[PDB]
Design an enzyme around this catalytic site. Structure first.
Site: not given
Ligand code: AMP
Ligand code: AS1
Ligand code: AMP
Ligand code: AMP
Ligand code: AMP
Ligand code: AS1
Ligand code: AS1
Ligand code: AS1
Lengths: 386, 386, 386, 386
Positions: B12, B92, B121, B168
């Site tokens: 992504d 974050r 997020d 995810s």
């Molecule tokens: N270790 C990391 N380094 C840089 N950006 C990150 C990192 N972990 C998460 N992110 C950012 O925040 C988003 C978190 O999404 P997710 O892992 O699907 O829950 C990613 O799509 C990135 O843009």
């Molecule tokens: N699955 C994910 N990460 C994490 C999280 C655990 C949770 N429920 C929280 O809000 O911290 N991605 C999403 C979570 C969200 O924004 O609620 C996104 O970018 O949309």
């Protein structure tokens, strides 16, 4: 003069029954409540008569206990200092209530209890009594007698012919409490083999066991599809959770009278009910209602712990908690395994969860506006700091 | 135009790297932070360069993460809606903070992230960004693009040269979050073998393992007598707890954005720390301080969850929590066994526990007066109800 | 298509009526509510038909306003940011409630209002609308048109045959709000002559006036011994407090949408009621109940201010407040004099005050015990500090 | 044996001095503190020697009182039960603090005070003493002696050479308290001419007076441009506010020992300071910080009222309030007129107010998204209620 004694059947309350006859030359009415201590309360009743009671009353209060005290407390999510589910705490109000009622029926002047002068129970018994009958006279032998030490009490016991014999136990349908003796050292693990209601985690089944609890308007009404009365339901969950070693707590708590003390508790059924309720709440309670409710639970908890059950502030908070709990209707599915309780599923006829709002009424771009507005005050702040 | 993107190296953010270039025709600086996802970030940094980044930066932020974010949060006893230890939430802010620093360093007017428009997020990255640099521009491709399916995204990936491959996940030094797909049915238990950080309790050691954690002024500093830096300490506790299957929770939580979501989390090290802290707190914190602190914790938790880390409310509450946490100095001894964590002991240099106050600090009569005064208003109440 | 417009008869809502007709090619049903603004609503209803409404409705909602919104809010002791008694805040839910009902009765798919995009009113209207009818459509012209300034709006109105005539006003039975224009400089005192509901304190009667207000189970039911309906009662107190210049507030408040705003308010009757209520509560409420209640009032106030009236959080807190307020039965006696309100007396049928306990059941010796116990934890803490 | 007595110079503390010497066969060290009671403390000091004290100490504690007790309390916005500004409450800790210090310097094992056994002061004195020196012995003659009436007390004094002379008073720099006697009837307006610190509003100037108070990091530092030390500043505001009859309160409050009592208070300077602080806060504090702070103020107020000044809960909360208060820098402009205090203007170096945002960064369409997201959970609820 007549005196109604909260009589359990133990050594101390037996010594107290003799002490009251001797000291006050009073007609002692012994009262034993069956609230799930797992003792034949009828034996306590005969032993009281044998010990000198001019009368002895034994009542099965298991249903009243759970329906009128445990359930309302659970609806509030009450937890004292992070772990104590208040097993001993909510039981005392019930007992003092009957003591007062019996005293009024038997035309008794005073009521007495055997809680010591170092604890919370004395407060719970007395605050309850005074709140119900402000004119009542209360006698607390541990605070009034001259015995100093276990040897003297035993000598006095033997002298009157009272049956004489690591920690002290207080048991009822909700839990079993252990404190004192070897438990007084906070750095020392409880002794192996102490627990009675719960099987040891290391000896628990190797196969996990699933259980479902149904809630209707805030109260649990069935286990695994079987409708059960309040007391029967707590009993059933005690059996299921007990076999798996669920609900053990070990804490150094703050007593209302000022000092810290090490307590160990086993609340199998109640622990299952704690997580089951929150599971059903997760689908049935509104976000803001929930966050507000959780910030008040701790206050309600100390109220119970300190002994303010029949107090206006507790009854007022109860109106809030009862209102909120009315929406808690659904089923929680939990997985029990070697001392743990795992929520694995939950459902409700009026669930607020909508898969369609999370899967890939919601417009992605509304989020940008939400964020910008939420961010405004922070942006103004940053700019002002230049 | 330059754009600094929070790049994880996944499909992504890879798609996003290309999308930004095409959409904005700007140079993209990819930023990858090592916060314990257990990934080689240099692999992501190089892939970012292959995908088109004009500059790829990778920093080891493990120590900053635990020291400046996880620890301050833990001092507050932060827990969202009963069980969530906020593993993803406190991460974050850290990331966004670097995105903004890098943009300032590189002369980039904008930052970008790959969080979706349906979640928390997005709010966390943006509230942080705006709070730190009010006129920064933020691009959230998920809220701006046209893909109308996963199939479209992969086609776009292949059409562009990006390697392509049930739920995810989001992993870091604190936890691993699992949600989406099969998990969207709150009545369905998570799939067997889903967990990665913790070993299945059914496959965990047959002998419990004891662990001791030392705290100094509110932060954990040693494990089993070995002094460890913040990230090293969390890592060590993740290993110990993970081996035992500790720290698993399953809940339906309320997102800040309005809807409920089913989430699953494994927080081994953090779960041990939660209980170890409270154990030490039970000897080092005053009753009233503790009770007040516990009633504020839930609020601090929602602030972290909503994304208000660099916000005045949170920093204000932090002053309170930090003040209280300063006394948390001592050692907790915990017992780990097949999924469960058990506090079995605690000690402290300045423990407020006094065995002589509970052994068989005031005399009996003191308690009587205390009770009478506490009962006064209840008796007046009963009398007026006459 | 039909649209129900909250029409007040002013220039802006008149412009809005025309704008809606053309922009949406819709039939506009005008709704004007008499909630104590001091304007003949029938004149607004007729101006609407002239302006082009296909139907114009006007209702006397004064009684429903005070009984179902003002009273429940006052029972909670709601005060926003130390001074704002929420006069405009509790009126918006009422208006939107009727907009939605009328929309349903007329078969209209949408409702419209004339609140601007930078205020709280738009939130109150819409949160209410959406909460009562989730799929209703709301149109807020201020957020949709592109008028570049006032001159442009006047030309539009002149072109449509709408009669065109240093601050903005909002009036109802509870208060009159003033903000904008010359009031925007927080360092500038409001101009002389601005107030309309209250007499300048400098021109108030030379003799103080006494007034008695009777409360029954939480709501005021009589003034100076005369029983009065909710609306008639607020009116009488407006007349009485007004003549003396009572109820003037001047604050810089935090709007829900993020920015601070300077507002001036006159709430004569409500101010008298605020102090009259607390006076009766001082004899009828328990100490702990009162203290808990006061710690929740502020949260409730922000709920009202933000617009969460028909929201579960608000309704839950209301359960608490209503429970507490049921005990508020008695009479408050106040003294009004040149801008101020003074409580000079209070009495209640079930007053908890007993001169018995303060004049020289109570034994001073009990106080010593109370003090020793309360002090135990402080003494232990001191000894440990060493 | 040496006993340090809080000696005011009056009849009762003089009686107490004689009583202490004989009852305890001890020498008494009298301590009189000038905290703005408007009396000559050297006079009480000399009288103490005449009465038999082995040493009499008199100190000017006006500055320490305001700087270390009043200001810290004010920063917290402390108000007890809606109106009590805690005038007597914050003074007691200071007195007891010195009693303990003098006891340590003089090698006295005990301290004494003349507060009665049915009030709050006894608790404030003793909790303070015990908190500071846990082994100190406290003697409260009112709770120990056998005088059975006022006439016997006069006879004892006349017998010991002590000179002998409708309500009782307590005065200091912050206020003057009036209670007892004719004030014991909550329905009776206080008697004409009772107030001393404030002029009756009926006699106050017909010309309103404007006053400006400058705040620096939470504390007031100047009045009308003139920099003044804490005590001189409070004095100044008492003079200005006093002339206008500002700061009068009449309440039935709840004492810590359980009963209600009618108290009348005049706090001219403090009342101006209360509103002045909030005026500056309206420009310098963030919305969320403010709302949180206001929900904690009442708790802090009861702590001060009950006597938990040198208590960990209070110091923990103080950390919060002091953090918040540090942003409180600016000038408040108030209008004083016949009993009332009107805020008419405020300004600050780092004011968070922006005319920018209210006049006709911000784009109204962001508001729609904000509203939509805020309304989501409400719409879901409505749909489920079907
Ligand atoms: N270790 C990391 N380094 C840089 N950006 C990150 C990192 N972990 C998460 N992110 C950012 O925040 C988003 C978190 O999404 P997710 O892992 O699907 O829950 C990613 O799509 C990135 O843009
Ligand atoms: N699955 C994910 N990460 C994490 C999280 C655990 C949770 N429920 C929280 O809000 O911290 N991605 C999403 C979570 C969200 O924004 O609620 C996104 O970018 O949309
Ligand atoms: N089931 C019961 N029936 C009557 N009185 C009881 C009961 N359980 C406890 N009490 C009273 O409360 C005290 C509680 O202490 P304990 O038994 O040590 O846990 C006893 O000493 C009794 O006076
Ligand atoms: N009495 C009323 N009847 C119907 N709608 C009203 C009434 N008072 C106010 N409104 C609506 O709410 C808005 C309030 O604006 P304002 O007077 O500027 O504070 C107007 O633009 C109307 O759309
Ligand atoms: N200025 C002072 N110096 C020394 N002791 C004081 C002072 N003001 C009050 N006290 C003590 O507190 C009590 C206060 O008086 P009262 O308000 O009549 O109950 C006296 O009996 C003294 O022992
Ligand atoms: N151990 C016992 N019962 C129960 C208690 C569990 C606990 N810590 C509680 O307060 O509920 N006896 C005591 C406890 C107490 O009053 O603290 C006594 O009578 O003195
Ligand atoms: N000025 C006016 N009315 C009333 C308000 C008193 C106040 N500050 C409040 O939020 O209730 N109109 C606005 C207020 C607003 O929404 O904040 C508008 O519709 O744009
Ligand atoms: N009246 C007097 N002083 C002051 C008090 C104002 C008040 N209601 C308060 O508690 O601060 N003497 C008493 C009051 C008391 O301590 O409750 C006594 O020594 O017994």
């Amino acid at each position: 003069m007549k005196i109604v004694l909260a009589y359990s059947g133990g050594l101390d309350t037996s010594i107290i029954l003799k002490w009251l006859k001797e000291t006050y030359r009073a007609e002692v009415i012994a009262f034993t409540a069956d609230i799930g201590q797992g003792e034949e309360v009828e034996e306590a009743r005969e032993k009281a008569l044998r010990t000198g009671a001019s009368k002895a009353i034994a009542l099965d209060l298991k249903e009243e206990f759970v329906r009128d005290f445990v359930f309302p407390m659970m609806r509030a999510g009450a937890v004292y200092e992070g772990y104590y589910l208040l097993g001993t705490s909510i039981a005392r109000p019930l007992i003092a209530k009957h003591l007062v009622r019996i005293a009024e029926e038997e035309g008794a002047e005073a009521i007495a209890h055997g809680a010591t002068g170092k604890g919370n129970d004395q407060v719970r018994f007395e605050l309850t009594a005074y709140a119900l009958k402000p004119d009542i006279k209360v006698i607390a032998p541990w605070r009034e007698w001259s015995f100093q030490g276990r040897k003297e009490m035993i000598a006095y016991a033997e002298a009157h012919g009272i049956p004489v014999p690591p920690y002290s136990m207080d048991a009822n349908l909700l839990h079993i409490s252990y404190e004192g003796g070897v438990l007084e050292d906070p750095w020392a693990e409880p002794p192996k083999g102490m627990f009675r209601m719960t099987q040891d985690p290391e000896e628990a089944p190797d196969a996990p066991e699933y259980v479902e609890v149904e809630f209707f308007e805030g109260d649990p009404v069935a286990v695994n599809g079987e409708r059960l009365s309040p007391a029967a339901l707590l009993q059933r969950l005690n059996e299921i959770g007990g076999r798996h070693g669920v609900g053990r707590v070990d804490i150094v708590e703050n007593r209302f009278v000022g000092m810290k003390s090490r307590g160990v508790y086993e609340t199998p059924g109640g622990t299952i009910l704690y997580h089951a309720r929150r599971a059903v709440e997760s689908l049935t309670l509104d976000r803001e209602v929930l966050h507000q409710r959780d910030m008040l639970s701790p206050k309600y908890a100390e109220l119970v712990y300190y002994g303010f059950w029949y107090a206006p502030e507790r009854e007022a908070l109860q109106a809030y908690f009862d209102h909120v709990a009315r929406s808690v209707t659904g089923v929680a599915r939990l997985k029990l395994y070697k001392g743990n309780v795992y929520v694995v599923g939950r459902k409700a006829p009026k669930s607020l969860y909508r898969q369609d709002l999370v899967s890939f009424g919601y417009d992605q771009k509304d989020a940008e506006g939400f964020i910008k507005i939420q961010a405004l005050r922070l942006r103004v702040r940053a700019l002002v700091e230049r």
